[PDB]
Design a protein around this nucleic acid. Sequence first.
DNA 1: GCTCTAATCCCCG
DNA 2: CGGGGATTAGAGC
Length: 68
Amino acid sequence: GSQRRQRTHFTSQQLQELEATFQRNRYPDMSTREEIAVWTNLTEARVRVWFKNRRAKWRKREEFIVTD
DNA sequence: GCTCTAATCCCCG
DNA sequence: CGGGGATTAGAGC
């Protein structure tokens, strides 16, 4: 890469659609990840890196534990 | 030096 | 297609 890494500055409005989706679908297809990007003014890869970090930081805080 | 977590590398099927 | 752990990265204590 050329621009190093941006990191963070997600707004609370993005989290309020992303978490409300993660409680009904933990593994969305690109056809749905682009819709989540329309509702937030993001793009599909931004939703995908949030979703794999959500599963990875579930594991890197709890490994198996869920309350759902 | 250490946490916390996003942006990405390499691997898996 | 894209998940999963390792990894590189970034701001606060």
